[PDB]
Amino acid sequence: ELEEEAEEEQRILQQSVVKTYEDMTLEELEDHEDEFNEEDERAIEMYRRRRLAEWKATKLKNKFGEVLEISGKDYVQEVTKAGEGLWVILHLYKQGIPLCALINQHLSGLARKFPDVKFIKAISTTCIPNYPDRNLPTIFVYLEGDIKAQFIGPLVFGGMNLTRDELEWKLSESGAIMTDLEENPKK
Amino acid sequence: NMERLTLACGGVALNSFDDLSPDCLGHAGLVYEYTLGEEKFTFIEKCNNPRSVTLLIKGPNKHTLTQIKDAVRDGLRAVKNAIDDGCVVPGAGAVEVAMAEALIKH
Amino acid sequence: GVQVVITDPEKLDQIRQRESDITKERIQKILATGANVILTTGGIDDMCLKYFVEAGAMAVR
Amino acid sequence: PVLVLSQNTKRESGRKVQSGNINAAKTIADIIRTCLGPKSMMKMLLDPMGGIVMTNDGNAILREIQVQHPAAKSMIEISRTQDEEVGDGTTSVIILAGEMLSVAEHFLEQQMHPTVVISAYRKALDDMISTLKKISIPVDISDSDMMLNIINSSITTKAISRWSSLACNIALDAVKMVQFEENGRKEIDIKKYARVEKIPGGIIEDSCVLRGVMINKDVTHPRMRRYIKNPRIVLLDSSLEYKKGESQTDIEITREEDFTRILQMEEEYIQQLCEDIIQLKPDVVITEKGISDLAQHYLMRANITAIRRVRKTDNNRIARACGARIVSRPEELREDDVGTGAGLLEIKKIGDEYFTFITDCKDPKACTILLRGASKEILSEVERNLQDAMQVCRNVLLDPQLVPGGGASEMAVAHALTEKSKAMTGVEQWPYRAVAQALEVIPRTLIQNCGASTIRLLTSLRAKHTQENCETWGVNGETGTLVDMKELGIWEPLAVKLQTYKTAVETAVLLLRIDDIVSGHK
Amino acid sequence: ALHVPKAPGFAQMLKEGAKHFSGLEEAVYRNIQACKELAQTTRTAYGPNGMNKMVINHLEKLFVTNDAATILRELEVQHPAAKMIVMASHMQEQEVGDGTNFVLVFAGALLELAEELLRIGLSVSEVIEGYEIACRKAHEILPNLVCCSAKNLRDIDEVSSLLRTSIMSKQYGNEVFLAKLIAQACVSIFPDSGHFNVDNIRVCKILGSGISSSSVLHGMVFKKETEGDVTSVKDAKIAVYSCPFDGMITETKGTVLIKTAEELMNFSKGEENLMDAQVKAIADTGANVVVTGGKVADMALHYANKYNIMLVRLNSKWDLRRLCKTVGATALPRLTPPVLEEMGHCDSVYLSEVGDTQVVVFKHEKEDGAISTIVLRGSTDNLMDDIERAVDDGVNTFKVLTRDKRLVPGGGATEIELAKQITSYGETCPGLEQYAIKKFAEAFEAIPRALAENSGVKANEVISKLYAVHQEGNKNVGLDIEAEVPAVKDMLEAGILDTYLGKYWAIKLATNAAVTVLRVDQIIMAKPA
Amino acid sequence: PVILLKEGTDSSQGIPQLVSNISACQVIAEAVRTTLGPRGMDKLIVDGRGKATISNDGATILKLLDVVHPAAKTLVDIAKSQDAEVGDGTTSVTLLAAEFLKQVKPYVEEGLHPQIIIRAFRTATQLAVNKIKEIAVTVKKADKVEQRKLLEKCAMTALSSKLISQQKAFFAKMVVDAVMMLDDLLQLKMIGIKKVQGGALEDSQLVAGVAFKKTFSYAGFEMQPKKYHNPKIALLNVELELKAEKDNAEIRVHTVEDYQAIVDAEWNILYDKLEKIHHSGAKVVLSKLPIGDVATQYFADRDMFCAGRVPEEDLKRTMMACGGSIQTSVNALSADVLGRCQVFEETQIGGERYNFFTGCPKAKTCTFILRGGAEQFMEETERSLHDAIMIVRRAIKNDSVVAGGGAIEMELSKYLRDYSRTIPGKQQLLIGAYAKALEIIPRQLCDNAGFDATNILNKLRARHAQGGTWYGVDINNEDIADNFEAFVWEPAMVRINALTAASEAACLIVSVDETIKNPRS
Numbered sequence A: 001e002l003e004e005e006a007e008e009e010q011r012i013l014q015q016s017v018v019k020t021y022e023d024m025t026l027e028e029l030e031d032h033e034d035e036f037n038e039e040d041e042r043a044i045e046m047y048r049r050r051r052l053a054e055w056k057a058t059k060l061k062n063k064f065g066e067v068l069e070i071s072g073k074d075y076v077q078e079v080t081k082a083g084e085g086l087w088v089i090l091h092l093y094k095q096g097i098p099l100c101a102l103i104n105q106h107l108s109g110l111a112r113k114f115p116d117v118k119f120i121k122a123i124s125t126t127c128i129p130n131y132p133d134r135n136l137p138t139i140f141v142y143l144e145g146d147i148k149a150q151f152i153g154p155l156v157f158g159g160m161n162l163t164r165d166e167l168e169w170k171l172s173e174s175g176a177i178m179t180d181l182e183e184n185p186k187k
Numbered sequence B: 001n002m003e004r005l006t007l008a009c010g011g012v013a014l015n016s017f018d019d020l021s022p023d024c025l026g027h028a029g030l031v032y033e034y035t036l037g038e039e040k041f042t043f044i045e046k047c048n049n050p051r052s053v054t055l056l057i058k059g060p061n062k063h064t065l066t067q068i069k070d071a072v073r074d075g076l077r078a079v080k081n082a083i084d085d086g087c088v089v090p091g092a093g094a095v096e097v098a099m100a101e102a103l104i105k106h
Numbered sequence C: 001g002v003q004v005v006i007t008d009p010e011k012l013d014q015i016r017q018r019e020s021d022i023t024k025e026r027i028q029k030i031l032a033t034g035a036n037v038i039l040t041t042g043g044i045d046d047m048c049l050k051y052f053v054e055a056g057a058m059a060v061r
Numbered sequence D: 001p002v003l004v005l006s007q008n009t010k011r012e013s014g015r016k017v018q019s020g021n022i023n024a025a026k027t028i029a030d031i032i033r034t035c036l037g038p039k040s041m042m043k044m045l046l047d048p049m050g051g052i053v054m055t056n057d058g059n060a061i062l063r064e065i066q067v068q069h070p071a072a073k074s075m076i077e078i079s080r081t082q083d084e085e086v087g088d089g090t091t092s093v094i095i096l097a098g099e100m101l102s103v104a105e106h107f108l109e110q111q112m113h114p115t116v117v118i119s120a121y122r123k124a125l126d127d128m129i130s131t132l133k134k135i136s137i138p139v140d141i142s143d144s145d146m147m148l149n150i151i152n153s154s155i156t157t158k159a160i161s162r163w164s165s166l167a168c169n170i171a172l173d174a175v176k177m178v179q180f181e182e183n184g185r186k187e188i189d190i191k192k193y194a195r196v197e198k199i200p201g202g203i204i205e206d207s208c209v210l211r212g213v214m215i216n217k218d219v220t221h222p223r224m225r226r227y228i229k230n231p232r233i234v235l236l237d238s239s240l241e242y243k244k245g246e247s248q249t250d251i252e253i254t255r256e257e258d259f260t261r262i263l264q265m266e267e268e269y270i271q272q273l274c275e276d277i278i279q280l281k282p283d284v285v286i287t288e289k290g291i292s293d294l295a296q297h298y299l300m301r302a303n304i305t306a307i308r309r310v311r312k313t314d315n316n317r318i319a320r321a322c323g324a325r326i327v328s329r330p331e332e333l334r335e336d337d338v339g340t341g342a343g344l345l346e347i348k349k350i351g352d353e354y355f356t357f358i359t360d361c362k363d364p365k366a367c368t369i370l371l372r373g374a375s376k377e378i379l380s381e382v383e384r385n386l387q388d389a390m391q392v393c394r395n396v397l398l399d400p401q402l403v404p405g406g407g408a409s410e411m412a413v414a415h416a417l418t419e420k421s422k423a424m425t426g427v428e429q430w431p432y433r434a435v436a437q438a439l440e441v442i443p444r445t446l447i448q449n450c451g452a453s454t455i456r457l458l459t460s461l462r463a464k465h466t467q468e469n470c471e472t473w474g475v476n477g478e479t480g481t482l483v484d485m486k487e488l489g490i491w492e493p494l495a496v497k498l499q500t501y502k503t504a505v506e507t508a509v510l511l512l513r514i515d516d517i518v519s520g521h522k
Numbered sequence E: 001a002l003h004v005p006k007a008p009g010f011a012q013m014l015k016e017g018a019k020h021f022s023g024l025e026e027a028v029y030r031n032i033q034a035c036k037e038l039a040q041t042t043r044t045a046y047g048p049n050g051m052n053k054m055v056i057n058h059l060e061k062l063f064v065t066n067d068a069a070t071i072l073r074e075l076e077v078q079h080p081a082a083k084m085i086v087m088a089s090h091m092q093e094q095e096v097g098d099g100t101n102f103v104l105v106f107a108g109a110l111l112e113l114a115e116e117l118l119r120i121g122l123s124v125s126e127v128i129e130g131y132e133i134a135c136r137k138a139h140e141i142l143p144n145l146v147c148c149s150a151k152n153l154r155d156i157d158e159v160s161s162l163l164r165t166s167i168m169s170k171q172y173g174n175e176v177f178l179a180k181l182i183a184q185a186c187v188s189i190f191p192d193s194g195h196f197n198v199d200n201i202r203v204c205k206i207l208g209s210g211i212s213s214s215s216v217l218h219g220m221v222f223k224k225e226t227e228g229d230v231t232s233v234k235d236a237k238i239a240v241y242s243c244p245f246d247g248m249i250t251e252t253k254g255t256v257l258i259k260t261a262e263e264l265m266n267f268s269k270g271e272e273n274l275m276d277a278q279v280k281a282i283a284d285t286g287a288n289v290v291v292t293g294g295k296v297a298d299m300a301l302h303y304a305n306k307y308n309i310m311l312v313r314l315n316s317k318w319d320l321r322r323l324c325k326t327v328g329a330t331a332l333p334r335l336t337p338p339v340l341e342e343m344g345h346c347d348s349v350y351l352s353e354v355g356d357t358q359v360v361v362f363k364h365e366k367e368d369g370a371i372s373t374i375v376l377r378g379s380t381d382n383l384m385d386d387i388e389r390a391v392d393d394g395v396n397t398f399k400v401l402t403r404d405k406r407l408v409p410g411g412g413a414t415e416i417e418l419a420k421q422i423t424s425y426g427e428t429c430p431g432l433e434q435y436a437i438k439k440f441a442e443a444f445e446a447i448p449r450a451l452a453e454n455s456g457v458k459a460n461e462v463i464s465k466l467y468a469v470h471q472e473g474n475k476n477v478g479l480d481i482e483a484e485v486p487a488v489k490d491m492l493e494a495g496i497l498d499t500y501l502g503k504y505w506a507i508k509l510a511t512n513a514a515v516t517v518l519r520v521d522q523i524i525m526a527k528p529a
Numbered sequence F: 001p002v003i004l005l006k007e008g009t010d011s012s013q014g015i016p017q018l019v020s021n022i023s024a025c026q027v028i029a030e031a032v033r034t035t036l037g038p039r040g041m042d043k044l045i046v047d048g049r050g051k052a053t054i055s056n057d058g059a060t061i062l063k064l065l066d067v068v069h070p071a072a073k074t075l076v077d078i079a080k081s082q083d084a085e086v087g088d089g090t091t092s093v094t095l096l097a098a099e100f101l102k103q104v105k106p107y108v109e110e111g112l113h114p115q116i117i118i119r120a121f122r123t124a125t126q127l128a129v130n131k132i133k134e135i136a137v138t139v140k141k142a143d144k145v146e147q148r149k150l151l152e153k154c155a156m157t158a159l160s161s162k163l164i165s166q167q168k169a170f171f172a173k174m175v176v177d178a179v180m181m182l183d184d185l186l187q188l189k190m191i192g193i194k195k196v197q198g199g200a201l202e203d204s205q206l207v208a209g210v211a212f213k214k215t216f217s218y219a220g221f222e223m224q225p226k227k228y229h230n231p232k233i234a235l236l237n238v239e240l241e242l243k244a245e246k247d248n249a250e251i252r253v254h255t256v257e258d259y260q261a262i263v264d265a266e267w268n269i270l271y272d273k274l275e276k277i278h279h280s281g282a283k284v285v286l287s288k289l290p291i292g293d294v295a296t297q298y299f300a301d302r303d304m305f306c307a308g309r310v311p312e313e314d315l316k317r318t319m320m321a322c323g324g325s326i327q328t329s330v331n332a333l334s335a336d337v338l339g340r341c342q343v344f345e346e347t348q349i350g351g352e353r354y355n356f357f358t359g360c361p362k363a364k365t366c367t368f369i370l371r372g373g374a375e376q377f378m379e380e381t382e383r384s385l386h387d388a389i390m391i392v393r394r395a396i397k398n399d400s401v402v403a404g405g406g407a408i409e410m411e412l413s414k415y416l417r418d419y420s421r422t423i424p425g426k427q428q429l430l431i432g433a434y435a436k437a438l439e440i441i442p443r444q445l446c447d448n449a450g451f452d453a454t455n456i457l458n459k460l461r462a463r464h465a466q467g468g469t470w471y472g473v474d475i476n477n478e479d480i481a482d483n484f485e486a487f488v489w490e491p492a493m494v495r496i497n498a499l500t501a502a503s504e505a506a507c508l509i510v511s512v513d514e515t516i517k518n519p520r521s
């Protein structure tokens, strides 16, 4: 909240294990400015130079923007040759099912929200032959084509409470599968 | 260093290049560069009248440098305190002896 | 849904003024009818508070 | 394994809990019993975070004490209440509440229902408030000497009593300087407009209240002037650099004259903002947010001193001291928003930091105490005593009544309502006179603190107090001797005394109403 | 009566893992003993007869060396006084290049004799003032011991014979070959006007045959390989680029916008046409070879192949800067074919196979260049590493020789002469500090003695013979390491001398370290994390 | 109370450490001692992954051991360096170093001094190298058939003691032909070899053109003819596949027939690239980047060959074989950039389909199609062919060659023994020990051959005393015989490098007296 920033100068400490300049990225690293001492300045400029250099390096990586227009004929090229280490989140869907429409819109919002991972969306019927209608909403993530998580189900997925919890469920991988449910439990 | 240079070299700090004039240049009587190990230093000296000087400390190891830095800080503060008020007290514990004798008398 | 796209640079700065002026306008309308107490459910940023203090009305957010 | 309640539920009921409740209260009255009076002893507390708090006042003592018994929590709550409402009498109210609970314990044990004890306590509270208001001595607000005496009386029991004749004055000035009126409303807003700032290292008597505002900032640029005679202060809420905005933009460039054009437009916008802020010919500009390099260049070109990010409270104090007005859009800055009235702006150096002063204002409605001492704890204690003095002065200003201190008011109201009791017939007389004798604790505590035989001294105090026109006869805790407060010149504001009695009786009632405890559940 | 509590004071308020030492016995003698042990650790690796050591550092990487600074660096030292001693040694290495083992031995001997003096009854301050006075005296008398200055620093035989003694301490068996090789490398780079630089002498280590096949070239050698199709060029007109060999791209994100079919069809053709135009413009100036600092494009590689251009890629800024210095070119951040003044010239650029390591060679032919390179040959990586360390120490001794040269006798001559003169001086002082003066004598005696004990010969006999000859008046005699018996030899005829500056700095740092470790009276160590 | 070094560092000051180092060196050399000599034996080593390596060359065996002793590390490094420099003799150099240490250990057990020992080793080794350079026989004729026979004999003796010894004459000849048809650079990447499972050993073939495994096939392959009698090879570096134009571009149009024109233009770009390829007169198309299914179908309709995703090395060998040049632009496919080969064929050998370009006249690169029973079998054949390749390549520069079988070692030992009679002091004893250690090679060889080492070695010593040099062992007859007349020829450079490296490592090992082992942070 910004209201704590104006109530009083006495905001000494409450649940702050670490408080230094090394974790202030850009937005807040430039709002103290005059409070950064003087003897440790050169370290601050070294840190900012290194971290802006890293951000500039990631500029070449984080340019995907929004959703794209892949169909069945383009599946193999963009799931086996889409790149080295680039996450691809395959989506199998059909027009008419509401829950998959919800998850499609949420994925579209995620596309601009997170441009590092460029998920691709494809029609269910004309991507894999004889795909049953009992698997209308389908999402599976992988990198280099090695399919990791392929959760299937119309109602077991829970598209009503998807938003952030299953957003990071798709996002976070290459480790423990159950990692973000406790953040936003349905209860 | 902006303030130190504009008080030593005599120029003026500039935040923009809207107007440049010869009065915006300070003067330096010798600017050279000395490379120590891998680091480099630039010396700006032979000024006409510096209002800001530097103390260069040379040491065979780090702890000597820190000791000299602490000594220099204490000495500079002592001299500044002497300058601030035109007074100075006798040392070597004489003032404590005299003050205690006066306290006993009082 | 609506997002701005600027092709020639000159048209940019103008919209930025609009990006505030709209709010300004509404305030005067609320202040045009002699109102001196303002109660609102939503939050009020600093500029609108400045309008209210300059006019002489209090704002409660 | 069938359980009606949870496994963690624990029930306690009957006389025992009542006894326990009383015990808990008395325990807290046992901690701060030696911190009351002019001969109070310092108490040192070790902060859980690693700090040290060396105080005498009850609230600053009980704030660092963690207690698991709920009655002890209620005692800490009454301490905080007394601190927040009137600012003085914390140890007094804690001691009275504890000892009234103790004296009610006797009637609790003698198979007497607590409701009659509560009713008797309420009647005693009403009578004691009435007879405390009866013996009030009016004060003259304009008399500076009388207010100095009142503040000295309130402060002589604490650490800064040695410098009392100095610190007293400071408090008075502040309370006479934050005093304000607008739209028919008076504020005396000490919390927000009378800042007290502590700088370690120096001399206690070097501290002073300023005719202005001091803050810990420095000029953004070396060449900006550090010494202004009659500044024209202008305050800014917004920032003076280029910002992205809110709506997503994604400008598209195809021609070869659009990138440099965009950058030149940014610079032109900053230049326009600086020219528009210069148009009113100010002299020092203060902003809560950042200043871009080009913006301060343009400000320098017009000989303007700019101060970078400043907290909102400091800017409000500066606006109140200079009479200026904080603005967000420099396009909408008028002449009446330019602060004329500051008589000096000094960028001075203290220790190894730069402090800016806007001192010597025409009639500032916000001050700042440059409070210089030896250590952070010493200055924290002096800060607490200064707050105590300000609260007492504000209470006197808002209420022109006084009442004798040193234990004279306690014994006076005790004797008065005891004489009232000796007429009424009924079973409620015993708790009533129990409260009457309960107020005797303050003179007893003072005598015990100064180191005198409390038995015959207190008996003689009561005997001398039985004589008429002797309600100002109290005990001098400096030497522990029966004196007259009129000649000793100690009087406390009626607000503090009546608030103390009210909240003490109320919390005694609260802790006396409860007879069951259920512990452990979510 | 079964537990002794802590003293009511600093002992009770001290933290758990902290340790406090105070007093002459509990704080000073411990430091003296630890420094003595540290000095005796490396004393066995002194002089030409010093024995190599294998150290396995904390990352399990073998180091086979007799370099005192390297030995102290690889093993981590925990005692703090030993830490100060190794800092002094490392500073002596940085300021001079040779003299680390001398620093260790002298400091250890000084501390041992200081402990003896403190046991005798002198105070710490008395010993400190005596040591400083005798150090001033030794520095005053040192310039009078020089003999046979160099005065040329450009004759190949002279510089070889002058560096042979500095090399001899490590590579005793193969001494003349390394001396001649390093002398060639240093002379061929020695500028006529200016200051000698040690960063401009490079060494390249490649597995292969014995030491006798190591060579020197007047250029520089990389371990890369040409990315093109041409590998041999004569009279190379080198163009050096600091930008990737590709069409330059906006650093702001720019996407190709196509609105009609013909734009889509012609975009790739236009890009290829521009690329070939740029490459042809580069090659029309005469650029036989091109070196780039980054990625090479496929289209760029094809067009360089079309116009007979050798494309070499370098992956380090220092490598590119050294290449620019050695060829006379300068890196530029745009394609912009080079103008006549900023385009390097080289005699040839080989691609070669030597030790199953393909290399690209920018060698010159007329013995010039600001950079010369040593190619080292050996059957073990660690042995070539030791050879590289010996080469570096020899080159550092050459650089010190470019400064005040004033060669001084070595092999125990200088230290024994200094000890005799300091004894003579201390016999005159009637104060209480004379003992401390008379201690540098023994402090110098540790240097030749080690030289004796490392050669399998009696040390006391050699010391007595050295005193006999030095009191006779011959101040140029010292230990003979090939005699197999205690013997003396004139050190001027042997031509094995030391730099005056090296001894000056070594004595100064050793005395400073001993004094600053004697000054400590209390130690307060926090528990390590 | 306070320690100098960190807790964990242990030292080994004294001569017992160097004696233990000598012992460790012998323990290492025991693990290679039995892989030497024509009657050699292989060795099977299994790592923690369960992958077994079967080999009898010292370099690979020492690589596969989890060596951590520093002296053992020195022996591993000397074997690696000898392998990299010459190509063989790694077992010989390891055994020589270990025997030097063994023969010097009794002298150092009584202290002595490492410096005199290393001085004696240096003097002895430089004398030995000078003797080898002096006594090596040079043909000094610069003939054609004679030099080829010399290289064939060197290859034959290199192949002996390997898994494929029984086919020596079949491989040696073959392999030298490879080295006989390289440019004057002997770029090793131009002798790229291929191994196909199945088939007997004698079926290994040397493709004078370029042979490589087929990479991939899209829907449309197997309609192309697989036999061309005079094709024009087109070596490409371009991706002949419908794809995104730039992977950075973006199309923004607002009308339907613009969309149709754009898709037609993309198809037109693809067909224009393919049409330039076809009109260039080419007949077989090779590409580094993938070739799409559309390109394959188009090429099949034009009755011509295509094969994409070809590796770097295969395309380079094709370019230096068929005479073409790699192109990443199909806009200038002139008649001078295409490659020409006599015959191209897509055949099927050993259950694997391979492309053969055979008949290139000016082919500077070859290919080995190696046949075997098991993967480790063909891998050991690969290692043996690599050793032969290295030996022949080193022998191309100079026809200076000595006779193997321990004859050169015996002559060197006799020379050093004669030298150690005219010098006084302990140097003569150390040189005698060096010479006596130099005779391990014939003794170990005949021990591997299961002979009586003592009697045959006494015969060898007595013959090298007087009568004639080059007399070494003869396993088949269990006797001694003239190795030079037996056409067993090892280039002098391998012996020179082995002796130099062995002396270097022995001097390095003897010249240490202290070891510190920090606690492995």
Ligand SMILES: Nc1ncnc2c1ncn2[C@@H]1O[C@H](COP(=O)(O)OP(=O)(O)O)[C@@H](O)[C@H]1O
Pocket (backbone or CB within 6 Å): D035, D036, D037, D038, D040, D057, D058, D088, D089, D090, D091, D092, D093, D153, D156, D157, D404, D405, D406, D407, D446, D475, D476, D477, D478, D490, D492
């Ligand atoms: N000089 C004095 N002699 C005797 N009593 C005093 C004197 N000064 C103050 N008091 C009494 O002490 C009480 C204030 O003590 P203090 O330490 O402030 O307690 P509290 O913090 O509860 O107000 C007042 O009730 C006042 O009557």
Ligand SMILES: Nc1ncnc2c1ncn2[C@@H]1O[C@H](COP(=O)(O)OP(=O)(O)O)[C@@H](O)[C@H]1O
Pocket (backbone or CB within 6 Å): E045, E046, E047, E048, E067, E068, E098, E099, E100, E101, E102, E103, E165, E168, E169, E409, E410, E411, E412, E451, E478, E479, E480, E481, E496, E498
């Ligand atoms: N032939 C020799 N006879 C006697 N002493 C020698 C001979 N050669 C070198 N020395 C001595 O050996 C010493 C080598 O010391 P060195 O190991 O270089 O010290 P540091 O390791 O501190 O550089 C020199 O001081 C030199 O005087």
Ligand SMILES: Nc1ncnc2c1ncn2[C@@H]1O[C@H](COP(=O)(O)OP(=O)(O)O)[C@@H](O)[C@H]1O
Pocket (backbone or CB within 6 Å): F035, F036, F037, F038, F040, F058, F088, F089, F090, F091, F092, F157, F158, F160, F161, F162, F403, F404, F405, F406, F441, F445, F473, F474, F475, F488, F490
């Ligand atoms: N047919 C043979 N007759 C006699 N000696 C041979 C024969 N083949 C090999 N040798 C000897 O065996 C020794 C070991 O050679 P080899 O095992 O092939 O490789 P390495 O020398 O690397 O061990 C060589 O010194 C060689 O002289």
Ligand SMILES: [Mg+2]
Pocket (backbone or CB within 6 Å): D088, D089, D154, D155, D157, D388
């Ligand atoms: Mg009070």
Ligand SMILES: [Mg+2]
Pocket (backbone or CB within 6 Å): E098, E099, E100, E101, E169
């Ligand atoms: Mg040395």
Ligand SMILES: [Mg+2]
Pocket (backbone or CB within 6 Å): F088, F089, F158, F387
């Ligand atoms: Mg072999």
